[PDB]
Design an enzyme around this catalytic site. Structure first.
Site, short mmCIF file in Angstrom:
data_model
loop_
_atom_site.label_atom_id
_atom_site.label_comp_id
_atom_site.label_asym_id
_atom_site.label_seq_id
_atom_site.Cartn_x
_atom_site.Cartn_y
_atom_site.Cartn_z
CB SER A 25 -0.95 -0.02 1.20
OG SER A 25 -1.86 1.07 1.18
CG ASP B 281 -3.03 -0.56 -2.15
OD1 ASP B 281 -2.86 0.57 -1.64
OD2 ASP B 281 -3.67 -1.46 -1.57
NE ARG C 32 -3.80 5.35 2.85
CZ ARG C 32 -2.92 5.51 3.84
NH1 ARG C 32 -3.27 5.26 5.09
NH2 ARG C 32 -1.69 5.94 3.57
CE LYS D 44 -9.71 1.78 3.06
NZ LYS D 44 -9.09 0.45 3.25
#
Ligand SMILES: [Mg+2]
Length: 564
Positions: free
Chosen positions: A119, A292, A295, A391
């Site tokens: 991430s 990734d 966010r 998300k």
């Protein structure tokens, strides 16, 4: 080089291969310098799948482009093949955003996927590497499965591998691999990294309304910063090629193995380049994504910062600008406990359920699977919908574009209108990084004992002018309405009669010693208060927070490491 042998490799177990909620994350050097480290972990994942279901199974595989990813995908293929896994779907060049993987697992009904991402953490030869396991609903493997993988990793003695199998990750289509003395073949399908995710977004959003918004001399001018991570090609192929935004809109949209030598982590400092670009006043809308793509940070004209707690609230308030929601309707709203209460104001007014969960995906996913959750957000730059089970940063940007197109206001004017209608939840998060563990633990135990006493409810704190009266104080607990689980000690909440809150959490990271997270949510309804500087409006509650917790005394810190 299409006919390969299955071999068994004796291995020595490791003891630290714990998948957690976001994947096993180790320094890249560890993966390179520890014999069979990656091999062992991948085998342990596959061993969780019953041998009788492997042939009919497909695993989705892709990652964020960071250094070491393709070498990991190759050995994932070499091990899935030897183990009797029937099929892999792999994004072109190994590239799949985390929302894309969740998209593809759910579309093709794969058993799960393996994402090669850490991430927001830095990438490169001197950076981190992560291996994340998702299951058949497209979401992160839950505790009971990651526990099993850990168990298997600690005592593993051999793994199976076809050392000669090499997948060409650069070319689209099916590659077939015939395994020596195995009747069924092993099939890899290389898919375009963006297509299935774009096709999902094309059904969720009004691409025609958006192309109109983004094209022509009257266009909304956007700058979209992928921070040299996975969402880059998604930006180019969807926002630029398909929706006609000028190519200069795609900032840092070429995936780089070191993410450009910086953290693909969207906030006002790691993404200061975007911020300065937006500062010029030329563009109406800016945004940044993490490594990734799950966010997102939202910026307005002149660098106006929409904090993630507000963003999810604005989307909720204008949710029907989004066709997906016009047709599913709004099944519910959710935020993590430390996220500001702006969303609650929208949910209360429009009379939709507001679920307040502990930090962590599993709580959002459970409610989603129950058809009780349509839109969720987190103060940590996370916004999502039940369109998938991760998300989704680019999804959140297209939601904002949909709302800008229907509202025909600037980002800032939309927020001002939001604050006038619902009031404003001023919000900040204070990070105290790497404080001594003994001091932080004492701070928390002392504060909790103080809050537990019968007299604490009702106590008053002057600011002054304003008086805060505590209405409730506890250590947050959540009984999950689906899986029955109870999560305790999820954070110390000071809830005030005026709608404001102070929240203390200890970060669950594996950094050297504890990290303290202090969240301040100060609600104001007055016209002369809602357009003041946030840090000025938050200062009284910050003072109360530090005094009641004796944080400086317990840690030696006179200032947070980070203010978000
Ligand atoms: Mg992420």
């Amino acid at each position: 080089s299409n006919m390969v042998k299955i071999v068994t490799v004796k291995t020595q177990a490791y003891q630290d291969q714990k998948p957690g909620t976001s994947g096993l994350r180790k320094r890249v050097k560890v993966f390179q310098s520890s014999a069979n480290y990656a091999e062992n972990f991948i085998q342990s994942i596959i061993s969780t799948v019953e041998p009788a279901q492997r042939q009919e199974a497909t695993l989705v595989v892709g990652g964020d482009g960071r250094f070491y990813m393709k070498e990991a995908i190759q050995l994932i293929a070499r091990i899935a093949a030897a183990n009797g896994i029937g099929r892999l779907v792999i994004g072109q060049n190994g590239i799949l955003s985390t929302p894309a993987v969740s998209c593809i697992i759910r579309k093709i009904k794969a058993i799960g996927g393996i994402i090669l991402t850490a991430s927001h953490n830095p990438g490169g030869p001197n950076g981190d590497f992560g291996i994340k396991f998702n299951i058949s609903n497209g979401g992160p493997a839950p505790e009971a499965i990651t526990d099993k993988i850990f168990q298997i990793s600690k005592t593993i003695e051999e793994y199976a591998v076809c050392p000669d199998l090499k997948v060409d990750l650069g070319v689209l289509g099916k590659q077939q691999f015939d395994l020596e003395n195995k009747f069924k073949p092993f099939t890899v399908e290389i898919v375009d990294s963006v297509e299935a995710y774009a096709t999902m977004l094309r059904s969720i959003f009004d691409f025609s309304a958006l192309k109109e918004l983004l094209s022509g001399p009257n266009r909304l001018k956007i700058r979209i910063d992928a921070m040299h991570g996975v969402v880059g090609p998604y930006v180019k192929k969807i926002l630029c090629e398909e929706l006609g935004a000028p190519a200069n809109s795609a900032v840092n949209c070429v995936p780089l193995e070191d993410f450009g030598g910086h953290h693909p982590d969207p906030n006002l400092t790691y993404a200061a380049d975007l911020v300065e670009t937006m500062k010029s006043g030329e563009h109406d809308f800016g945004a940044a994504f993490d490594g990734d793509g799950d966010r997102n940070m939202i910026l307005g004209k002149h660098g106006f910062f929409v904090n993630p707690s507000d963003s999810v609230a604005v989307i909720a308030a204008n949710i029907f600008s989004i066709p997906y929601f016009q047709q599913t309707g709004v099944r519910g709203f959710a935020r993590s406990m430390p996220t500001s209460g702006a969303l609650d104001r929208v949910a209360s007014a429009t009379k939709i359920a507001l679920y307040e969960t502990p930090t962590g995906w599993k709580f959002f996913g459970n409610l989603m699977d129950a058809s009780k959750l349509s839109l969720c957000g987190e103060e940590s730059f996370g916004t999502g919908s039940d369109h998938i089970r991760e998300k989704d940063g680019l999804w959140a940007v297209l939601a904002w574009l949909s709302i800008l197109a229907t509202r025909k206001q600037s980002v800032e004017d939309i927020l001002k209108d939001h604050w006038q209608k619902y009031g404003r939840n001023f919000f900040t998060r204070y990070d105290y990084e790497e404080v001594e563990a003994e001091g932080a633990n004492k701070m928390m135990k002392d504060l909790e004992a103080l809050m537990f006493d019968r007299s604490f409810v009702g106590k008053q704190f002057s600011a002054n002018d304003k008086v805060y009266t505590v209405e409730k104080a506890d250590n947050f607990e959540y009984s999950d309405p689906v899986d029955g689980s109870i999560s305790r000690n999820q954070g110390l909440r000071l809830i005030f009669t005026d709608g404001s809150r102070i929240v203390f959490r200890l970060s669950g990271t594996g950094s050297a010693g504890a990290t303290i997270l202090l969240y301040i949510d100060s609600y104001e309804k007055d016209v002369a208060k809602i357009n003041q500087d946030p840090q000025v409006m938050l200062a009284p509650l910050i003072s109360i927070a530090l005094k009641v917790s004796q944080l400086q005394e317990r840690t030696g810190r006179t200032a947070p490491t980070v203010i978000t």
